[PDB]
Design a protein around this ligand. Structure first.
Ligand SMILES: *[C@@H]1O[C@H](CO)[C@@H](O[C@@H]2O[C@H](CO)[C@@H](O[C@@H]3O[C@H](CO[C@H]4O[C@H](CO)[C@@H](O)[C@H](O)[C@@H]4O)[C@@H](O)[C@H](O[C@H]4O[C@H](CO)[C@@H](O)[C@H](O)[C@@H]4O)[C@@H]3O)[C@H](O)[C@H]2NC(C)=O)[C@H](O)[C@H]1NC(C)=O
Ligand SMILES: *[C@@H]1O[C@H](CO)[C@@H](O[C@@H]2O[C@H](CO)[C@@H](O)[C@H](O)[C@H]2NC(C)=O)[C@H](O)[C@H]1NC(C)=O
Ligand SMILES: *[C@@H]1O[C@H](CO)[C@@H](O[C@@H]2O[C@H](CO)[C@@H](O)[C@H](O)[C@H]2NC(C)=O)[C@H](O)[C@H]1NC(C)=O
Ligand SMILES: *[C@@H]1O[C@H](CO[C@@H]2O[C@@H](C)[C@@H](O)[C@@H](O)[C@@H]2O)[C@@H](O)[C@H](O)[C@H]1NC(C)=O
Ligand SMILES: *[C@@H]1O[C@H](CO[C@@H]2O[C@@H](C)[C@@H](O)[C@@H](O)[C@@H]2O)[C@@H](O)[C@H](O)[C@H]1NC(C)=O
Ligand code: NAG
Ligand code: NAG
Ligand code: NAG
Ligand code: NAG
Lengths: 327, 49, 177, 294, 49, 49
């Protein structure tokens, strides 16, 4: 049994490499800046210190993961990308124009709130964007600016035509993309005659195959759904901290200031102590959840590094390892 | 005394490694108060007086 | 609730746009008031979000004002071993807050020094530099790094991009290997 | 039946409003799609221009537990026309009306043994003067021992006789004619909160709500805050002394003329119990969509 | 299945779906694993494979 | 009972994530050295597979 017709199937995959780096000042959140509260917090002592240790260690380990992945993925030699790249194949939607157009559409179609990197203080003076300080917790920016990711993706896109022509990564073979895809499609069991006589039809098939996914960003995309799920996971992880101040843990009020201005001192000591216990339990559970998410992110980052090192810079022969059908 | 004192006491040592560390955020002082909502009617104390 | 004498101390328009401790007749807290369009039921006079936090208030004097919080500066520090050097960063905020309105313990002194604006906020304790570092050991945020010396100072450099070895592409039948 | 998704009869939160959010909230509501407790008001017998002996139901003989208050929708009829209730052969335009509620904590039998006699202080909500008057009082009633009178012979029920030909003239309004009708059957003493409520009259359906808490007896209405909508709102807190156990209504009839009998709207009554509802608070703070849990 | 309160959900695929899938794989593994490229199927007798 | 249920939810999520990752490994094994003859030493079979 032998096929007659064929198409270029497009497969979209998402790998979450690193969750959002978050830290929180312990006694600032738990105590909310009251002096007798702070005196009633000092007997616990090192609890805030050890949760700061855990968050700092997780953040530094995720920094190491990001640096390792973005250093291993960097190609040794690449080629500049200009308009007119790829010859007859219209892959100009992946051309940078900086950020790529597909990344622009992807970031447009997903709900993202920037955490006020310029004037979030002013965005609370006169405008989650403002709730980051209402309870009080920092949102760290990623390890590298967007231009670094743009440079990495541009270099890898300029080198993807050239790395995969000969085994061994010492040489570089920055061929025009037409002869690249001709040899890559020849190596998977296609005679050279049919590709030598039918460049135009396979080129048009390639063009419509790449253009099919431009409008494909909807619920039907598995990878888009995973992107939305990861962003929603970050949002609900932040909202768990942002919503626990409403809980009283059996207290009569959600405000420490209302307690200190409302009650008899010996009973409000017990009320504040139960508030301390509940908030510290919530922070400990959040520490454990952050550690679990960090472990999952590190393992997925390792898998992503392996996947981009195997079937991106070279044509993998493993059946369906990273793409259905013959990759 | 200072933030480095708290950072030293957070690690329970006189020696810590280099890097970026989150420290206790301070708070700006309040500038005053506002006390106004719907009142202006006096409670009844005439049979008490 | 009781009453006091006012003149012009407890007016919303008087203390507009500043951090004040509001005590609105059984609603006590701190925050910053701001002029907003009228949203919600007028007679209830208290609008809340899904987290039971007061969003705004219908003034007897005027109308609805918003209030969010008494927002202040979150502080991070950078400190180097074997060289007793440290600097302070205030994230996501312009170089607009100075040593006047403090809280908590105290703050340290550097030397006597302009507050450097940066994409990660406002930093005290650093100096500008037209230098590029590809092997940064103190990842400050975005593409910014701190560089020590070998009693020196602390420098702010940009985390550069290791540009790969460029090769030219041919439109002819030959090839540039 | 009440459609909560259609936002019909849902008590607002008493002190705090919201905006443009879908929020779960623990409040006091009726069950979904209850068919109500229909009582209708119909005019009495009339021959030409002579209002004859009245024509009322057996509402007074039945009593119900107050529980957690109740809501009443008014003008569930809405601008319409329909057959005259006393005379089915004739149809007239339906005009809205407000009901009178008798509210107490002790039951007993009347002079003839008819159940419905109430001891001690009772709260009466009597509408008066073409609906513009909303008298309400937690005061003391005594029966009268005359003909067709509650402590006397030939007595079946007490109601309100209303002559709109003399009352609903332009101005005047007969100077609480229905309270004098109330005094025609009872004697009144030891009074508490006489309360007057000037309102206007229209033909738009609205809502009234009654309950009691530690503050006292709480009265809610749409009228003052939401005329053109249908949302429900606090307006009064009357300082009652005692918790309310039992309630009934006062039948109402109209001394109209025979050739100009007018149709009257029938209200609906729904009991209140604590539930948890998901409410879609709009931008303006009004409620236009809500769903249940139970 | 009821007395504690939990409900054990039924499996997503039938036993017959499992049998059909395993039969398809056992048929395919005789032929696929001789020449690479998954476009063509090569149902050689098992001994020669 | 609520604490017991929460612990059950936590261990259920942990076991489900572990089973999903192991199923991904199973998919890799079944399209690696089942539909084709591998040369990897001891990846899915002791001795020469
Ligand atoms: C029996 O007879 C009376 C007598 O006229 C009728 O009264 C009319 O009632 C309708 C229904 O409200 C009035 O129509 C107008 O509808 C507008 C639409 O409002 C939208 O937005 C609100 C707010 O979210 C929603 O609640 C609503 O459902 C709609 O989605 C309103 O904006 C109107 O209010 C404005 O009215 C006039 C102009 O119409 C202005 O002068 C006012 O200031 C106000 O801004 C109003 O609600 C209609 O106006 C009423 N007539 C008169 C003469 O007032 C009864 O409706 C009728 N019963 C029926 C028909 O069933
Ligand atoms: C190459 O692909 C790009 C990406 O789709 C094309 O740009 C858009 O093409 C659609 C129709 O294919 C037009 O409706 C849009 O107006 C185009 N965008 C812009 C900014 O012009 C582009 O036309 C394709 N080029 C070729 C030669 O096929
Ligand atoms: C009330 O909340 C809804 C729900 O998000 C808001 O509706 C969104 O409005 C924006 C701006 O027009 C649209 O881009 C979204 O698609 C809308 N969402 C949905 C689900 O329709 C609405 O704007 C809010 N109202 C106000 C005044 O902020
Ligand atoms: C807020 O100020 C209004 C004056 O005009 C406003 O100007 C700026 C401040 C914007 O808020 C803009 O939307 C307005 O047009 C007053 O009309 C309004 O009553 C003020 N609000 C109050 C007093 O609550
Ligand atoms: C530190 O220097 C950076 C370098 O940017 C370039 O040089 C300065 C003098 C400006 O001309 C700027 O527009 C140039 O792009 C500045 O980006 C940065 O703002 C400088 N820091 C401060 C606090 O000004
Ligand atoms: C292949 O499929 C395309 C569309 O799917 C069709 O237009 C074309 O005629 C087909 N060619 C053959 C040889 O089947
Ligand atoms: C309440 O009614 C009962 C029965 O008539 C009577 O005995 C009692 O004195 C009354 N109490 C008051 C306070 O009116
Ligand atoms: C108030 O109640 C008492 C007890 O029933 C009664 O004696 C008295 O006459 C009442 N007062 C009036 C004004 O009727
Ligand atoms: C009700 O209306 C009449 C008519 O003008 C007026 O005299 C009276 O004061 C009003 N009462 C209230 C309580 O508004």
């Amino acid at each position: 049994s032998i096929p007659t017709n064929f198409s270029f199937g497009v497969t979209q995959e998402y790998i979450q490499t690193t969750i959002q780096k978050v830290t929180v000042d312990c006694k600032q959140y738990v105590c909310n800046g009251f002096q007798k509260c702070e005196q009633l917090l000092r007997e616990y002592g090192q609890f805030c210190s050890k949760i700061n240790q855990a968050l700092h260690g997780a953040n530094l380990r995720q920094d190491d993961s990001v640096r390792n992945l973005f250093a291993s993925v960097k190609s040794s030699q690449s080629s500049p990308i200009i308009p007119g790249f790829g010859g007859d194949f219209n892959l100009t939607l992946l051309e940078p124009v900086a950020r790529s157009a597909i990344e622009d559409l992807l970031f447009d179609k997903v709900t993202i709130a920037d955490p006020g990197y310029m004037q979030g203080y002013d965005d609370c003076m006169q405008q989650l964007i403002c709730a980051q300080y209402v309870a009080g917790y920092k949102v760290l920016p990623p390890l590298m600016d967007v231009n670094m990711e743009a440079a990495y993706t541009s270099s890898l896109l300029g080198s993807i035509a050239g790395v995969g022509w000969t085994a061994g990564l010492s040489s570089f073979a920055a061929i025009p993309f037409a002869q690249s895809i001709f040899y890559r499609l020849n190596g998977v069991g296609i005679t050279q005659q049919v590709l030598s006589e039918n460049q135009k039809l396979i080129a048009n098939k390639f063009n419509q195959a790449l253009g099919a996914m431009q409008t494909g960003f909807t619920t039907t995309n598995e990878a888009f759904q995973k992107v939305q799920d990861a962003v929603n996971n970050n949002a609900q992880a932040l909202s768990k901290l942002a919503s626990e101040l409403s809980n009283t843990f059996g207290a009569i009020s959600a405000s420490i200031g209302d307690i200190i201005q409302r009650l008899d001192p010996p009973e409000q000591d017990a009320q504040i102590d139960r508030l301390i216990n509940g908030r510290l339990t919530t922070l400990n559970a959040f520490v454990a959840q952050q550690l679990v998410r960090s472990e999952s992110a590190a393992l997925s980052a390792q898998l992503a590094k392996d996947k981009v090192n195997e079937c991106v810079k070279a044509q993998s022969k493993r059946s369906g390892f990273c793409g259905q059908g013959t990759h | 005394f200072n933030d480095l004192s708290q950072l030293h006491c957070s690690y329970e040592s006189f020696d810590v490694e280099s890097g970026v560390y989150s420290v206790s955020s301070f708070e700006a002082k309040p500038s005053g108060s506002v006390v106004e909502q719907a009142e202006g009617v006096e409670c009844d104390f005439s049979p008490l007086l | 609730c009781p009453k006091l004498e006012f003149a012009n101390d407890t007016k919303i328009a008087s203390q507009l746009g500043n951090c004040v401790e509001y005590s609105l007749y059984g609603v006590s807290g701190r925050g910053v008031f701001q002029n907003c369009t009228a949203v919600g039921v007028r007679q209830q006079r208290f609008v809340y979000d899904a987290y039971q936090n007061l969003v705004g208030y219908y003034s007897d004097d005027g109308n609805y004002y918003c209030l969010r919080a008494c927002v202040s500066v979150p502080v991070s520090v950078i400190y180097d071993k074997e060289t007793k050097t440290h600097a302070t960063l205030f994230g996501s905020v312009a170089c607009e807050h100075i040593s006047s309105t403090m809280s908590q313990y105290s703050r340290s002194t550097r030397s006597m020094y302009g507050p450097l604006q940066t994409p990660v906020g406002c930093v005290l304790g650093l100096v500008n530099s037209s230098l590029f570092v590809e092997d940064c050991k103190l990842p400050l945020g975005q593409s910014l790094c701190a560089l020590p010396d070998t009693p020196g100072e602390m420098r702010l450099a940009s985390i550069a991009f290791n540009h790969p070895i460029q090769v030219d592409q041919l439109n002819s039948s030959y090839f540039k290997l | 039946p009440i459609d909560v998704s259609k936002a019909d009869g849902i008590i607002y939160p008493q002190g705090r409003t919201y905006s443009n959010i879908t929020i779960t909230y623990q409040g006091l509501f009726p069950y979904q799609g209850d068919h109500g407790d229909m009582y209708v008001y119909s005019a009495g017998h009339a021959t030409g221009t002579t209002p004859q002996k009245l024509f009322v139901a057996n509402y007074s003989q039945d009593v119900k537990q107050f529980a957690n208050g109740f809501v009443v929708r008014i003008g569930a009829a809405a601008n319409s026309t329909g057959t005259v209730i006393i005379s089915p052969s004739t149809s007239a335009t339906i005009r809205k009306i407000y009901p009178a509620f008798m509210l107490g904590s002790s039951v007993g039998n009347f002079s003839d043994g008819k159940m419905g006699r109430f001891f001690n202080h009772t709260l009466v909500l009597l509408p008066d003067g073409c609906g513009t008057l909303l008298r309400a009082f937690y005061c003391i009633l005594e029966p009268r021992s005359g003909n067709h009178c509650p402590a006397g012979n030939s007595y079946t029920s007490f109601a309100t006789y209303h002559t709109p030909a003399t009352d609903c003239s332009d101005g005047n309004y007969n100077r609480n004619a229905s309270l004098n009708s109330f005094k025609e059957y009872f004697n009144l003493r030891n009074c508490t909160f006489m309360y007057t409520y000037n309102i206007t009259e229209d033909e738009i359906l609205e809502w009234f709500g009654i309950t009691q808490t530690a503050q006292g007896v709480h009265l809610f209405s749409s009228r003052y805050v939401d005329l053109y909508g249908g949302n429900m709102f606090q307006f009064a807190t009357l300082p009652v002394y005692d918790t309310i156990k039992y309630y009934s209504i006062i039948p109402h009839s109209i001394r109209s003329i025979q050739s100009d009998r007018k149709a009257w709207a029938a209200f609906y009554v729904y009991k209140l119990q604590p539930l948890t509802f998901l409410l879609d608070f709009s931008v303006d703070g009004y409620i236009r969509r809500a769903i249940d849990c139970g």
